[PDB]
Amino acid sequence: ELLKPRTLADLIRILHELFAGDEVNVEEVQAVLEAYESNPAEWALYAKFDQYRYTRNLVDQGNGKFNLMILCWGEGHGSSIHDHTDSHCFLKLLQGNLKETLFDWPDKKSNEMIKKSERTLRENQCAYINDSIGLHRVENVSHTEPAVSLHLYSPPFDTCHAFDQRTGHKNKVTMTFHSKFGIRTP
Template identity: 50%
Template sequence: MLPMATPLKTGISLEQIACAKRYPLMQALIGEMRSIFRDDHVNIEDMEKTLLSYKSDPQDWSQYALFDERNYTRNLVDTGNGKYNMIVLCWGPGMCTNIHDHSGSHCFVKMLEGQLKETRFAFPEQNTAGEPLVKTGESYVAVNEVTYMSDQLGLHRMENPSHSENAVSLHVYSPAYDKCSLFDQRTSQRHTSQVTFWSRYGKLSDSDDVPFDRIQTSSKRG
């Protein structure tokens, strides 16, 4: 995991940056994040403030919000010159992730539309194989709110609790990662899953880039 750094204090809002450079707000947000990640340090407070300062506007992100009626989707927006992945996730009603870790990466989530429920679990101890995971809490993330997760805080599952409405969320992972561990809630058993993208920069990925395992790692809860 990247170490934390000293907070940046620009005092300039995303709206001011976007207006001055005639950028869409999403481009201004990407520019600010690239500045935050310009070296090998991550400041959690700085990232949270930057994401909170962005007010969700579908005109900014709709080109990246590509849905699949069968599963939630990961849509790559920016790679930050290899320092992070910025991804728009699209959730149909009732869709959820498996319980998973973040392979040593920081995870920031900004809610763009709808609501997500987050359920957290403690990392299983080495001598607890076969025993259920211990739930440590649950919370909801509403539009324009930001939440943070890392392996130091445990495992989590994210889900769209609505039975009728879609949800869209913006996720930033640093360092960028291409795999994670999935955990069985009943037995604590884990296995590795590749992180794949439904689309890249607003265009659907090739079918070969979306393996069948993606269907196994995204589902609907009854």
């Protein structure tokens, strides 16, 4: 029984219900994320930016079942091309816009990774990715507007791979949290 989340706190409560079991109804999770109307006052505590790159701000650890985090993208900040470590990954825009570029998994042959598609994710929209869909890069291409996004990963993961667009070669990278539960974590 999916009801509209009234607030971020209500969304979190609903997510704990949707992840109470061992499987994930992706379409329901995506729908409830989309239905939460971003309210900046509710997530200001987590919106901690860094001047030089995007930050990852942990909001909730789920039932051990998921990481819910807010990513804060300064103007021009973007990610590597990366995978999602065999997890579901949902990305909902809370403020601004992000460009998502999709790539196929590289072949063993060292070649340039050519994008398969791109799209512009707009405020309140929720995208979904997993490794079977492909790899992606997420960018705030704005020169004037920060972006803020709400990400949910299940199962949680703390490492992923970055892919070199020139060759397809990958390297393992550990996620660092800029803050946890509103507290800066140097």
